[PDB]
Amino acid sequence: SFAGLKDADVAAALAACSAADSFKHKEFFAKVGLASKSLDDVKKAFYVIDQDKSGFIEEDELKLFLQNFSPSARALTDAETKAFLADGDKDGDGMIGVDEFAAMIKA
Template sequence: MAEAVFKKFDASGDGKMDAKELQAALKEMDVAPSKDLLKAIMAQYDKAPKNGLLELNEFKNLVADLQTIQNASVEEVLDTFTTFDKDKSGFIEPDELKEVMTSLGMGSDENTIQAMIAIADKDGDGRVSVAEFANIIGHGK
């Protein structure tokens, strides 16, 4: 599936997908990415040599991660939330998200963390509740 979607939206046919092509491909897969989410995805999945483009193998990694998230059970969602919520406050704060992302070897620069919080934080309080977390990964009401 990932390869077919990649080929369909690689408009230039150069084997690389820019942010505009990625946005169209994600919409095809029922993911409506914001501008901030696109930036965060590009930052996370564009591996060396970081060229601002996703190649097929990088796109496949993104699709695999999206499928894992969509297939997660409610129990797995809650387990993941509690892993992020280090102080057990019931919210994922930016510092907690940064700590987890760093420990996973994932993008943890300030812009990426702020983009991730902004994507999930629907009430605008600067942190992510369990309901917001569930909604962002497709397990909310």
């Protein structure tokens, strides 16, 4: 479940990455419906994923990204986590800010 998205899409996206090392963030964002959301709505999702309200999604929040969609979902592997970070971190600061998050989703 994730507010604004359809539960069945979220559940399908989680099933599609059930195997370790099968997560592909851009595929997940399409399947769960975020790639089809407005920029406004994508921004709302960022602030939720930023669990500590620091203004950035840090690596630990990427590792636990799926928990925002189901608390019992798996952690991303270290490989998946670092791949997610490298793809999104366009300014190189080691974190994902709101504009970087939207850019990955609305590409």
